[PDB]
Paper text:
[name] plays a central role in the molecular and cellular mechanisms of allergy, and is a validated therapeutic target in the development of new approaches to treat allergic diseases such as asthma. It exerts its effects through its two principal receptors, FcεRI on mast cells, basophils and antigen-presenting cells, and CD23/FcεRII on B cells. The Cε3 domain is thus the critical domain for receptor binding. A branched, bi- or tri-antennary, high-mannose type carbohydrate chain ((GlcNAc)n(Man)n) is N-linked to Asn394 in each Cε3 domain, as seen in previous crystal structures of [name]-Fc and Fcε3–4 at different resolutions, and with varying degrees of disorder.
The [name]-Fc structure, space group P21212, with one molecule (two chains) in the asymmetric unit has been determined to 1.75 Å resolution, which is the highest reported for this structure. For example, in [name]-Fc chain B a terminal mannose residue, Man 952, forms a hydrogen bond with the main-chain of Arg342. Hydrogen bonds mediated by water molecules are also formed between: Man952 and Ser344, Ser341, Ile474 and Ser475; Man953 and Thr492. In contrast to Fcε3–4, there is to date only a single crystal form of uncomplexed [name]-Fc despite extensive crystallisation trials (authors' unpublished observations). This may imply that the Cε2 domains stabilise, through extensive contact with one of the Cε3 domains, an intermediate quaternary structure (between open and closed). The [name]-Fc data however shows a two-state unfolding, the first event, in the absence of urea, at 55 °C (Tm1) and the second at 64 °C (Tm2). The latter is taken to be the unfolding of the Cε2 domains, occurring after that of Cε3 and Cε4. We show here that [name]-Fc unfolds in a two-step process, the first involving the Fcε3–4 region with Tm values similar to that of intact [name], and the second involving the Cε2 domains. Since the Tm1 and Tm values for [name]-Fc and Fcε3–4 respectively are very similar, the Cε2 domains have only a marginal influence on the thermal stability of the Cε3 domains.
Author numbering:
A (entry chain B): 225 to 253, 253A, 254 to 545
B (entry chain A): 228 to 253, 253A, 254 to 544
Amino acid sequence: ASRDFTPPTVKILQSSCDGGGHFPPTIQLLCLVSGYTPGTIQITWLEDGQVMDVDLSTASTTQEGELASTQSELTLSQKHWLSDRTYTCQVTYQGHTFEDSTKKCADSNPRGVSAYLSRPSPFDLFIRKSPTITCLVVDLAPSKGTVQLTWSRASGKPVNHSTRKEEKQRNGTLTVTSTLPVGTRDWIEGETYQCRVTHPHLPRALMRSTTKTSGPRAAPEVYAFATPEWPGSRDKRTLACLIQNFMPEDISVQWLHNEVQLPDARHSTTQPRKTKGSGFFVFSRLEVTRAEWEQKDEFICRAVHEAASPSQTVQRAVSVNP
Amino acid sequence: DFTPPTVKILQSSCDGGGHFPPTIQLLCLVSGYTPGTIQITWLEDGQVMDVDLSTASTTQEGELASTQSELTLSQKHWLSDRTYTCQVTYQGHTFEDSTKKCADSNPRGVSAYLSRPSPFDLFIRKSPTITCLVVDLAPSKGTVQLTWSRASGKPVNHSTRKEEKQRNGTLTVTSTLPVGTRDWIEGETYQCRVTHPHLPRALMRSTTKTSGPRAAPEVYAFATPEWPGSRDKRTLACLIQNFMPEDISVQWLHNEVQLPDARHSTTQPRKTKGSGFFVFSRLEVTRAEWEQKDEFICRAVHEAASPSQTVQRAVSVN
Ligand SMILES: *[C@@H]1O[C@H](CO)[C@@H](O[C@@H]2O[C@H](CO)[C@@H](O[C@@H]3O[C@H](CO[C@H]4O[C@H](CO[C@H]5O[C@H](CO)[C@@H](O)[C@H](O)[C@@H]5O)[C@@H](O)[C@H](O[C@H]5O[C@H](CO)[C@@H](O)[C@H](O)[C@@H]5O)[C@@H]4O)[C@@H](O)[C@H](O[C@H]4O[C@H](CO)[C@@H](O)[C@H](O)[C@@H]4O)[C@@H]3O)[C@H](O)[C@H]2NC(C)=O)[C@H](O)[C@H]1NC(C)=O
Ligand SMILES: *[C@@H]1O[C@H](CO)[C@@H](O[C@@H]2O[C@H](CO)[C@@H](O[C@@H]3O[C@H](CO[C@H]4O[C@H](CO[C@H]5O[C@H](CO)[C@@H](O)[C@H](O)[C@@H]5O)[C@@H](O)[C@H](O)[C@@H]4O)[C@@H](O)[C@H](O)[C@@H]3O)[C@H](O)[C@H]2NC(C)=O)[C@H](O)[C@H]1NC(C)=O
């Protein structure tokens, strides 16, 4: 009887706060797939879109009459819940996916507006040779008046045309991004750029400025390494790179493989920190697969930095096999 | 042989933007108990709610019953900050739990954080501590009050308290509480409670040991080759990875003695691509040191390592 087919639905319940309104020390999320026509079912949990380890959750399926029911429970620390991460219950049933998401409920009062202004990245300055700076305005209330965002130079010389994006966010706020192309000689020779943000509902105008970092210079050292093969790493292995003793701290790190620049999401790179003596260091970690090194067994860690000579780059290769 | 009832309340979640749904369900669960007479009653600010507002049902599996009751509230009532109590009467005796909407997490822009003990303090020094940090307070009058307690109500020791005004005009308050080694390992919950004169209600943070799976770290240690112009220095790098949970301590040793903490730097734990976390540790060394003895030890202390919560790896310059 195909007329009796009952598709699954998804809802998430959570641990309640106590009689004082306070979070418990751990949070349970309970994904409920109510009565559906019995069939093969799998539940995957996502943390900000990344698959979570199945070890962190349980799952149970019962059948009552002609209908099945499945629940999965995920447990989180209070610290992680307070970090405003979003969790997704992803249900796969007979080749069709359902899902639902949740995060900590929003606070009763809205946050004030904030603004951020970046310097150009070394990769854009020296590889692409098309540098830009970005002014980012967050926590705006939508459906108000549109926000004015104006660029100027301390020298009084003209700015180029910028591009502007406005995007409604899941939490109901608005973000505005403005990206300004800058002259390469202008930037290297110390020009100061300002982003000025105004709106009638703001208390005052917001102003941010940016300019090349002053002070001493020093070129980066680069070292690439591979972890050994062992029973836990037969068809994957971990590569690492240490980049150190450079100044100032602005740097771009990439990994290259078989004439491809790998996506930024493939690796994890730390924030620049001070060496005991002079300069900064960063570490980068890249997990690679057997199919990649069977394609070509050469992985390159590359740093882009203004003091690297002769062409603002330093790089080192590593191989995983003999 | 007897399994008493327990009470827990679950509620409708907010969506991916943190928004409330049109109605709020509260679900009172009495799961896995020796069968007997049972009633579930809901109170709103201590008064019995109409019988038609909730439905209870009971099932049995093996030697144990389970009971649940669901109450539906309007968004407006939930947001009014009323207290809802699930009152369970089993064999004539009463068990209660209560809930209300979660209080703001960053009232007036403040943040508060509460740590777990470091593994070195817990397993090596056997003097574990936890730390409660409150940031972005106003430099107003009226001292910020910070109080410690255990979920079990057992006593706590005195704590430290430190304030200092920051360069940005804010005030941070920090307190560190010593905890019992056995008390922590057996799963006690510790609570930090902060009251400021300008805050409308008390702010609380709670911490306890992890409830997830455990996995010991892998430890790998490397020495940099000589870089042109730096004959008398080398850098040692240690990668520690795939451990769970994320709490970890890192030490370096040379000549059987532990080096001062100021000698090295360790990154904060970050997720791998799959299960577990990694950190990097960095140690600069001198020619005098490796010519004296060319062996340096990167040691990790972690609750999942056996038999003594330690895993380590040595490295040599040559
Ligand atoms: C409602 O929801 C929205 C989101 O949906 C949320 O909005 C976020 O709000 C927070 C703050 O409230 C914003 O966080 C800030 O982001 C700033 C911008 O960061 C991006 O751009 C950086 C600049 O990149 C350019 O320049 C560099 C340098 O030259 C160059 O390398 C680049 O190539 C590029 O050209 C970039 O560095 C950054 O990437 C880093 O950070 C991410 C995330 O941490 C990390 O994953 C990367 O690996 C990389 O390390 C990112 O791409 C940022 O500058 C700013 O940082 C300042 O503040 C923090 C703490 O606040 C300090 O620690 C730091 O030192 C700086 O002082 C801050 O992180 C975030 O961008 C919003 N997200 C949006 C708009 O999508 C609202 O808050 C929500 N509201 C409520 C009420 O809930
Ligand atoms: C004004 O300026 C102040 C600076 O003075 C800004 O305050 C900082 O704000 C940021 C962001 O809000 C804070 O970052 C947060 O820090 C949390 C604490 O991390 C620190 O402690 C961790 C735990 O170590 C303790 O506990 C272990 C185990 O018990 C023990 O071994 C130790 O003894 C320690 O006692 C460390 O892991 C960590 O490295 C830090 O040392 C952190 O947990 C959060 O995730 C978050 O990163 C920062 O701490 C604030 N700094 C200060 C000094 O208050 C403030 O934001 C500025 N205001 C504005 C408006 O910008």
